[PDB]
Amino acid sequence: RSLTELDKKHFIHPFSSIQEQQHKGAKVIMKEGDGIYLTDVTGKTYIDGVSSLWNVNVGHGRVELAEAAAQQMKKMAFSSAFSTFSHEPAIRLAEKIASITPEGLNAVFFTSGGSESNDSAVKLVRHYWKIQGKPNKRKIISLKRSYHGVAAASTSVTGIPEFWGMAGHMMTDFLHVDTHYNNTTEQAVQSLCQAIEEAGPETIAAFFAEPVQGAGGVIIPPEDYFLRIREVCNAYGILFVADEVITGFGRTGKMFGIENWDVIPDVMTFAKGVTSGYFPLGGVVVSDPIHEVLKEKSVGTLFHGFTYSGHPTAAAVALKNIAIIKEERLVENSKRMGDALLHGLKKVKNRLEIVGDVRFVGLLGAVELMQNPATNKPFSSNLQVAPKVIEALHELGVICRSVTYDHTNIICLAPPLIINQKQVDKLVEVIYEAILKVQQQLG
Amino acid sequence: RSLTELDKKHFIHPFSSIQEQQHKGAKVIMKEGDGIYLTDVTGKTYIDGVSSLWNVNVGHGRVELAEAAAQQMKKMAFSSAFSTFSHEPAIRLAEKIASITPEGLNAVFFTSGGSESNDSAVKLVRHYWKIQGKPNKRKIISLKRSYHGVAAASTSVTGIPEFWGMAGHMMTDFLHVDTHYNNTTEQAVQSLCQAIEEAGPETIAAFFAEPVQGAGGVIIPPEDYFLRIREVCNAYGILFVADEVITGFGRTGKMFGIENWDVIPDVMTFAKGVTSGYFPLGGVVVSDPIHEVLKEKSVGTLFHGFTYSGHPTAAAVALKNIAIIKEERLVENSKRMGDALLHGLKKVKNRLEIVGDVRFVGLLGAVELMQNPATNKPFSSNLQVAPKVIEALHELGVICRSVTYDHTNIICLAPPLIINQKQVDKLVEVIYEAILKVQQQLG
Ligand SMILES: Cc1ncc(COP(=O)(O)O)c(C=O)c1O
Ligand SMILES: Cc1ncc(COP(=O)(O)O)c(C=O)c1O
Ligand SMILES: [Cl-]
Ligand SMILES: [Cl-]
Numbered sequence: 001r002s003l004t005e006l007d008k009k010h011f012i013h014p015f016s017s018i019q020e021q022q023h024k025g026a027k028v029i030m031k032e033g034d035g036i037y038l039t040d041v042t043g044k045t046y047i048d049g050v051s052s053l054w055n056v057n058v059g060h061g062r063v064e065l066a067e068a069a070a071q072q073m074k075k076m077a078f079s080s081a082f083s084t085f086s087h088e089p090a091i092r093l094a095e096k097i098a099s100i101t102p103e104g105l106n107a108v109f110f111t112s113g114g115s116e117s118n119d120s121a122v123k124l125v126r127h128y129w130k131i132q133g134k135p136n137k138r139k140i141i142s143l144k145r146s147y148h149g150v151a152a153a154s155t156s157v158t159g160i161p162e163f164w165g166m167a168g169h170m171m172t173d174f175l176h177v178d179t180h181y182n183n184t185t186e187q188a189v190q191s192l193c194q195a196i197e198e199a200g201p202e203t204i205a206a207f208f209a210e211p212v213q214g215a216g217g218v219i220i221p222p223e224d225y226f227l228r229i230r231e232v233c234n235a236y237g238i239l240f241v242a243d244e245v246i247t248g249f250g251r252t253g254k255m256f257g258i259e260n261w262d263v264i265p266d267v268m269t270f271a272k273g274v275t276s277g278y279f280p281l282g283g284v285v286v287s288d289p290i291h292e293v294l295k296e297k298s299v300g301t302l303f304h305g306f307t308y309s310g311h312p313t314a315a316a317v318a319l320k321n322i323a324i325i326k327e328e329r330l331v332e333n334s335k336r337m338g339d340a341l342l343h344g345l346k347k348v349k350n351r352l353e354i355v356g357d358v359r360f361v362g363l364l365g366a367v368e369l370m371q372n373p374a375t376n377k378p379f380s381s382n383l384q385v386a387p388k389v390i391e392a393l394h395e396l397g398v399i400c401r402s403v404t405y406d407h408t409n410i411i412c413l414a415p416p417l418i419i420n421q422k423q424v425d426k427l428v429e430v431i432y433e434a435i436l437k438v439q440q441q442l443g
Numbered sequence: 444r445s446l447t448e449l450d451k452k453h454f455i456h457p458f459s460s461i462q463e464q465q466h467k468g469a470k471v472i473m474k475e476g477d478g479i480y481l482t483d484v485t486g487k488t489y490i491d492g493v494s495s496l497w498n499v500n501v502g503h504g505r506v507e508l509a510e511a512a513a514q515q516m517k518k519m520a521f522s523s524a525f526s527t528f529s530h531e532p533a534i535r536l537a538e539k540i541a542s543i544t545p546e547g548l549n550a551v552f553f554t555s556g557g558s559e560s561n562d563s564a565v566k567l568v569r570h571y572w573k574i575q576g577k578p579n580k581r582k583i584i585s586l587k588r589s590y591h592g593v594a595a596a597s598t599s600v601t602g603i604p605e606f607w608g609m610a611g612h613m614m615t616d617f618l619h620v621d622t623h624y625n626n627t628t629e630q631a632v633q634s635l636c637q638a639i640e641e642a643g644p645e646t647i648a649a650f651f652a653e654p655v656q657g658a659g660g661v662i663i664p665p666e667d668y669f670l671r672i673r674e675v676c677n678a679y680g681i682l683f684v685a686d687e688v689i690t691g692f693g694r695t696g697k698m699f700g701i702e703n704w705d706v707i708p709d710v711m712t713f714a715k716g717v718t719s720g721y722f723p724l725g726g727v728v729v730s731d732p733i734h735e736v737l738k739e740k741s742v743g744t745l746f747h748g749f750t751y752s753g754h755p756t757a758a759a760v761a762l763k764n765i766a767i768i769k770e771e772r773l774v775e776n777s778k779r780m781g782d783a784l785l786h787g788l789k790k791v792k793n794r795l796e797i798v799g800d801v802r803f804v805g806l807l808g809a810v811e812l813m814q815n816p817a818t819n820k821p822f823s824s825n826l827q828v829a830p831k832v833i834e835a836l837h838e839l840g841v842i843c844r845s846v847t848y849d850h851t852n853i854i855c856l857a858p859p860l861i862i863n864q865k866q867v868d869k870l871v872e873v874i875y876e877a878i879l880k881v882q883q884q885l886g
Contacts, residue, residue, distance in 0.1 A: 003529070003531060003534050006534050006535075006537070006538050007529050007534045007537075009538075009541075009549065009550070010534070010537035010538050010540075010541050010549060010550055010551060011524075011529065011533055011534055011537040011550075011551060011553075011753065012550050012551065012552040012729070012734070012737070012745070013524050013525070013527055013528075013529070013745070013748070013752070013753070014524055014525055014552075014553075014745070014747065014748020014749060014752035014753070015525040015526065015744055015745065015746065015747070015748040016524070016525060016526055016527045016528075016744065016745060016748075017527065017743055017744050017745065018737050018738055018741050018745055019738065019741070019742065019743075020527055021527045022738055024527070025527075026527050026528065026529040027526060027527045027528055028528055028529075029528075029529050029530060029531065029534075030519060030522040030528065030529075030530045031518075031519065031530070031531065032518055032519050033518075033519040033520070033521075033522065038519070038522065041531070052521055052522055052523045053523050053525065053750045055521070055750060056521055060519060060520070060521075061517060061518075061519075062516070062517075062520070063517055065516055065520065066512070066513040066514075066516035066517045066520070067513065069509070069512050069513060069516060069756075070509040070510065070512060070513035071509075073505070073508055073509035073512060073721055074504060074505075074506055074509045075474075075475055075476075075504075076473060076474065076475050076476040076481070076503060076504075077476070077503070077505070077508065077509070077720065077721040077722075078476075078495055078498070078499055078503075078719075078720035078721060079473040079476065079481065079495055080495045080496050081454075081456050081457055081459070082456070082457055082458040082459060082496065083458065083459055083470060083844075084456055084459045084460065084463055084464045084467070084468075084469050084470045085456075085459075085469065085470055085471055085472075085473065086446070086450050086454065086456070086469040086471075086472050086473075087472060087473045087474070088446060088472065088474065088484070090454055091446050091449050091450045091453070091454055091472075092449075094449070094450075094453035094454040095449050095452075095453050097453075098452075098453050106452065106453060107452070107453055107454075107455050108453060108454060108455065109455040109457075110454075110457075112555045112556055112559075112723045112751070113555055113559070113749055113750060113751055114749075114750060115559070115594070115749060116555075116556070116558070116559065116594065119594045119595050122595065122610070122613070123593070123595070123598070123609060123610035123613075124610075126610035126611060127609050127610050130610070130611070135611070138611070149749075150566070150746075150747050150748065150749070151558070151559065151562045151594040151595055151596070152562050152565065152566070152594055152595035152596030152597070152613065152614060153594070153595030153613050154595070155566070162744075162746050163746050165746065166566060166570050166745065166746040166747050167565070167566035167567075167569035167570050167573070167747070168569060168573070168578070168581070170565070170566075170595065170596050170613075170614050170615065170616075171595060171613050171614070172613065172615060173613075271750070272750060276521075277520065277521035277750070277751075278516055278520040278521060278756070279520075279722070279723075279756070280555045280722075280723045280751040280754060280757070286455070291455070294455070294461050295461055295462065295465055298461050298462070299462065300460055300462075301458055301459065301460050301605075302455070302456070302457070302458065302459060302460065302461055302609065303458065303593075303605050303606050303608065303609040304457065304458070304593050304609050304610070305456070305457020305458040305459075305593065306457060306556055306557075306558060306592075306593070307496045307498060307556060307557060307714070307715060307720070308555070308556055308720075308723040309456070309457035310454065310456070310457070311723060313512075313721070313722070314723070401526075
């Protein structure tokens with residue numbers, strides 16, 4: 001009660017309705033986490049159905065991660081990486097990331113989050129073309145329904161228009177093309193080609209894509225989509241940036257999302273699950289040719305970086321986090337439990353009247369709600385079906401998040417990679433019960 | 444030796460010359476820190492003369508900060524603050540920050556760093572005017588020689604042109620006016636007025652200033668400067684944003700830098716010393732009227748925020764960090780040891796031939812080098828005097844940083860707030876010996 005009033009007075013939340021906060025107070029005040037579970041201050045326990053924010057990949061309560069952070073903080077919590085200063089944790093983490101990326105992605109620039117990483121990637125690809133002598137190759141192409149963060153550049157690279165309306169556009173040379181959502185590869189790829197030709201490939205620096213569009217509703221591309229993308233980018237001399245902020249570190253049943261489509265990007269950004277959210281960290285990995293151009297032509301000080309780039313404690317936590325993912329076979333577990341969740345939720349679809357698509361790639365998936373799945377009739381937006389299911393799930397002990405941009409009704413699912421079959425079974429049953437409740441309240 | 448080669452191959456550093464890295468390897472590889480000291484992998488020990496990056500304010504090796512992080516990471520390392528979800532650490536930290544800011548600055552938006560904070564502040568002031576019905580009040584005014592970070596907006600708000608040349612300008616509605624460096628208050632304030640009138644106050648959202656320009660060379664404004672600034676901002680209906688990223692949390696001998704000038708900003712950003720760099724954290728504090736406008740007119744979800752906004756572990760570390768600053772009287776110690784360092788370095792000035800200005804406000808200060816201090820003749824830039832002093836300091840066991848933008852030669856000084864008088868004495872003597880060595884090599 002005191003915590004609720006203090007929150008209202010003093011804490012302006014990210015991605016929260018301030019008017020809701022003032023009227024109702026915090027929806028929930030979390031206190032403790034353990035494995036896939038979170039407990040609030042009233043003692044009620046929940047399954048953390050999207051891993052908090054698609055990031056607590058190894059689960060809550062990891063004594064080993066706490067110990068790895070405490071050991072480095074006693075030893076040397078922070079040291080500068082500026083002016084070529086370095087330290088062993090960042091070096092070892094960079095070497096480790098290079099050992100687990102796609103072939104040729106061996107050089108890492110560190111940050112503290114996903115927005116920082118994507119803003120850095122925009123600046124790095126523009127820097128790359130400028131030192132190449134092509135200062136006109138400047139524009140960033142990205143997808144509708146994409147989400148790339150909300151620092152000033154990534155706010156406009158983000159393809160969901162709600163994010164532009166908070167402050168307006170601050171960036172300039174950005175272009176949004178059609179997504180593969182409910183589209184063929186040829187349609188999506190031709191939209192990219194048409195925009196490239198309207199703009200002229202000599203003005204374009206890079207194409208950014210999430211392997212699986214996360215905030216857009218877990219949009220999983222056709223099997224040939226990124227093969228084409230990679231061929232188009234090659235043909236026009238455009239850099240392909242893969243945004244692995246959600247899909248990285250085992251989330252889709254591969255170490256990185258893009259491996260599902262057998263394509264190597266020029267650049268990759270990451271954050272979130274690299275530390276299972278225990279410590280803010282992100283970064284940008286670049287290909288060998290790009291690193292070589294940097295070495296040859298990036299003269300003097302590289303005028304970009306963050307105080308906390310390469311933070312030794314972040315790096316110590318990330319190293320232990322990656323070792324856990326390897327030792328517990330969490331990449332493989334993510335693929336098998338994603339299959340198990342998809343199989344179960346398909347059965348649930350057949351028990352209900354209002355479930356449309358059910359899709360997963362590893363432990364990254366989604367359940368669409370529709371007035372008539374067989375004809376693909378959606379609910380009108382004013383019924384707010386997916387948010388109602390979120391609320392019913394919440395009351396039944398499951399935290400999920402919904403996506404309704406542009407008249408969709410999508411329940412997102414992405415539990416921690418440690419989840420087991422017993423737990424998948426209960427999660428599926430609760431999802432059934434919550435959709436059934438809303439299905440019933442709708443007459 | 445293996446660490447040096449791995450660093451070259453895999454780690455692209457912030458604000459480092461990649462070509463230097465490839466040719467010479469990391470200048471230093473740090474291993475351990477304790478209090479004001481750092482030790483590298485060869486066993487050589489250094490005084491951390493700028494607190495690593497103006498941020499390790501309570502010193503290295505704090506077992507209490509390690510323990511505070513480990514306790515929260517075992518309990519609940521991360522939980523979302525989106526959708527009005529909350530948790531006790533962020534609530535308590537927000538309440539704590541509100542207890543120590545200038546009067547009326549009671550509501551906090553959290554981030555993970557200084558660039559994130561300033562990009563958020565740009566977006567928040569633009570949001571504020573848009574919901575006020577003035578979508579044209581958009582432009583951000585800032586100072587030459589300022590540094591506000593290098594996310595996409597803060598890259599252009601930053602007033603030092605080197606930062607623009609890495610990727611070019613990405614932002615649009617920015618304006619740079621003359622700094623108070625070697626200037627009168629009336630000159631600096633009239634430059635601000637002239638630009639406001641050329642642009643028209645109806646197009647201007649905000650004026651950003653560091654209380655003390657840090658990366659610009661520790662530029663300390665005249666005593667009346669911010670009084671005038673605050674009157675000009677009031678007169679034109681412009682928001683005054685104080686960038687406390689360096690000057691916050693005791694650095695200048697006050698809790699916040701702006702208190703030295705008896706002025707309350709509309710908005711304040713912070714990072715760095717809030718956790719003494721033990722855990723990435725930053726934020727934006729807004730005045731009561733602004734919070735009230737948000738409450739009344741910021742409809743629906745606030746479409747801004749970072750995954751790690753309000754990170755529970757960051758907040759637990761920051762709380763203990765602030766309690767240390769209070770219990771060890773570090774704000775007062777910073778003022779007294781700044782006075783002691785200024786007094787000592789003035790004596791050193793009189794023993795040497797090439798020291799110009801010596802200035803401090805608390806433990807934030809600078810020592811200028813000049814060919815002829817009495818007539819104010821500078822060294823030509825091609826002599827690189829200040830960087831040579833940096834190197835000589837380094838070899839004598841002191842890490843400082845230099846500022847040479849626009850033909851200056853400035854040694855920056857900002858040791859952790861725990862430094863004691865014995866330590867100030869040794870630091871002063873080493874500074875004397877290093878400037879004397881370069882003074883001598885220059886014939
Ligand atoms: C795909 C993607 N990229 C970037 C971001 C931004 O990351 P952060 O919130 O750490 O700045 C997000 C956050 O959800 C994301 O989902
Ligand atoms: C005054 C000021 N503002 C902002 C920043 C950027 O902070 P960060 O490096 O955490 O993004 C800096 C960093 O030195 C700074 O000195
Ligand atoms: Cl392990
Ligand atoms: Cl204490």
